[PDB]
Design an enzyme around this catalytic site. Structure first.
Site, PDB file in Angstrom:
ATOM      1  CD  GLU A  78      -3.066  -1.057  -0.130  1.00 52.76           C
ATOM      2  OE1 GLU A  78      -2.131  -1.992  -0.596  1.00 52.76           O
ATOM      3  OE2 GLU A  78      -4.368  -1.173  -0.201  1.00 52.76           O
TER       4      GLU A  78
ATOM      5  CG  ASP B 253     -11.508   8.613  -5.617  1.00 55.11           C
ATOM      6  OD1 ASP B 253     -12.002   9.388  -4.921  1.00 55.11           O
ATOM      7  OD2 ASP B 253     -11.049   7.571  -5.383  1.00 55.11           O
TER       8      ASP B 253
ATOM      9  CB  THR C  76      -9.507   8.952   0.621  1.00 50.95           C
ATOM     10  OG1 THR C  76     -10.578   8.674  -0.648  1.00 50.95           O
ATOM     11  CG2 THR C  76      -9.095   7.450   1.115  1.00 50.95           C
TER      12      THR C  76
END
Length: 238
Positions: A22, A40, A45
């Site tokens: 990640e 996005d 986020t």
């Protein structure tokens, strides 16, 4: 088996292994303070497994945090998190929210709330489904790593859809099948899922990490662990 991946020390190895793919770092806890709108359509986020303002899970996260610590500095944003949910809106959030999130990340109870949500939705469902399947810790890990990237659910590219493809090809240990045979099958299905996602990475987390532990016969995920993500080596010595 015993505690498997639920073991405190093995659970931490599992957290560094996901973080090596990640974040290209074994330092997973460095992401508690992360937050940005990546463009996005999910809104903001942030945190250790990407909670989002659009999704409903950042609102659950700080509701959890407010149950744990009633006067924490994020609870003022609960009306705003509630209006915004289901959209990429910044209404009532924006720059104070993002300064506030990063201050809150220094509070160990906000850290504990992110960990509790990670566990609630990803870690405890993947590990428990893996033990239901008769999988040892490398299988349990392979499930976790997959629900972290592909998310819960039964659609074809989410975790339950990847487990369904695997089980069409091979039988589980719980069913009477052979574990490294079921796990090459899972891994194959996982890898396929990954290459299906638009704007993909490479697939080293399977190719030079997970499959490597499988060919070594390391089905209990006992250290030393040596692997690569993206051409870079990592070692957990014990």
């Amino acid at each position: 088996a015993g505690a498997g991946l639920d073991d405190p020390h093995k659970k931490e190895i599992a957290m560094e292994l996901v973080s090596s793919a990640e974040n290209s770092s074994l330092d997973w806890k460095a992401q508690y303070k992360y937050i940005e709108d990546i463009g996005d359509g999910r809104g903001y986020t942030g945190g250790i497994i990407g909670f989002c303002s659009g999704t409903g899970d950042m609102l659950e996260l700080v509701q959890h945090y407010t149950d744990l610590e009633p006067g924490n500095i994020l609870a003022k944003y609960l009306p705003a998190l509630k209006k915004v949910n289901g959209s990429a809106s910044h209404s009532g959030l924006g720059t104070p929210f993002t300064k506030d999130w990063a201050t809150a990340a220094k509070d160990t109870v906000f850290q504990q709330a992110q960990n509790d949500e990670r566990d609630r939705v990803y870690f405890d469902p993947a590990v428990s489904q893996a033990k239901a399947d008769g999988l040892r810790a490398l299988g349990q890990f392979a499930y976790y790593d997959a629900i972290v990237m592909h998310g819960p659910g039964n659609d074809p590219t989410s975790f339950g859809g990847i487990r369904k493809t695997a089980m069409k090809k091979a039988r589980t240990p719980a069913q009477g099948g052979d574990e490294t045979t079921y796990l090459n099958g899972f891994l194959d299905a996982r890898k396929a899922a990954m290459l299906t996602e638009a704007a993909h990475d490479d697939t080293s987390r399977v190719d030079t990490e997970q499959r490597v532990f499988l060919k070594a016969g390391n089905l209990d995920l006992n250290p030393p662990l040596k692997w690569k993500t993206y051409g870079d080596p990592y070692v957990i010595n014990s």
